């Protein structure tokens, strides 16, 4: 259960449907879907890296 | 404001369930199309209103019912927008 205390509140997320699905404004710094999936894939990869580099040393 | 929006969701819930309830923004056209269609259904249902209409026009009852079913599509003309 303690795993729910590891999770932190994410930064601001974007709403695609807001204002009739308008063209998204650049430099808004709101995460979209593809930003989220990149971060998820990137942390999976980073832990694979540390798990590999653990066994070497 | 929020009370306006909660009234709005409740009334569209009703209108889906019972076809033909209104809300504060029912137009004339909508109200009258509902009461035309309800009238047609009522005429089909009662046997003696349907007899009366089949006598007053010299038609058979099957023709009368079929014409009433044809009128159910646009009973009051096209939508007014």
């Amino acid at each position: 259960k303690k795993h729910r205390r590891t999770m932190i509140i994410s930064p601001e997320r974007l709403d695609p449907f807001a204002d009739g699905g308008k063209t998204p404004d650049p430099k808004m710094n709101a995460r979209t879907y593809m930003d989220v999936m990149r971060e998820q894939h990137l942390t999976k990869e980073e832990r694979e890296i540390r798990q590999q580099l653990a066994e070497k040393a | 404001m929020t009370d306006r929006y909660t009234i709005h969701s409740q009334l569209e819930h009703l209108q889906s369930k019972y076809i033909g309830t209104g809300h504060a923004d029912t137009t004339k056209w909508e109200w009258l199309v509902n009461q035309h269609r309800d009238s047609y259904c009522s005429y089909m249902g009662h046997f003696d209103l349907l007899n009366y209409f089949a006598i007053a026009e010299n038609e058979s009852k099957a023709r009368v019912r079929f014409n009433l079913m044809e009128k159910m599509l646009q009973p009051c003309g096209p939508p007014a927008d």
């Binding site: 695609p16 879907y33 | 569209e12």
Partner: protein, 126 residues
């Protein structure tokens, strides 16, 4: 009681919330051509699939087989609802990419059903 009885209310029971699907069918701006009806028995699908895969892959910047197969699964029914498909993709893609995406996938399926072979015009060419 194997689960609780209480599981939340469904949308048919609860009047406190408005119908979000109808509301989005009003306010999103859909592409020009999506009103034309499509029959999928008249369309060949597996020739359509690699273009979709490639199209989604470059829009996304990576490949998501769940979005891919989701799009494919929506096209399995006989008359696919195009407006719901643009809504259901708007979350994953920009909502501007979803509009463009339907705007090219839909006339392509129209061209496919007009053919006898099942194949749209630009794919008969090439």
């Amino acid at each position: 009681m194997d689960a609780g009885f209480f599981r939340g209310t469904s949308a048919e029971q609860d009047n406190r919330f408005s119908n979000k699907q109808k509301k989005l069918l009003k306010q999103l701006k859909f592409a020009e051509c999506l009103e034309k009806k499509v029959d999928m028995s008249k369309v060949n699908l597996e020739v359509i699939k690699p273009w979709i895969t490639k199209r989604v892959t470059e829009i996304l910047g990576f490949e998501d087989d769940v979005v891919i197969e989701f799009i494919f699964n929506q096209l399995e029914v006989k008359n696919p609802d195009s407006k719901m498909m643009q809504i259901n993709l708007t979350g994953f893609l920009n909502g501007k990419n979803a509009r463009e995406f339907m705007g090219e996938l839909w006339p392509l399926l129209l061209s496919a059903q007009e053919n006898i072979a099942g194949i749209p015009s630009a794919f008969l060419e090439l």
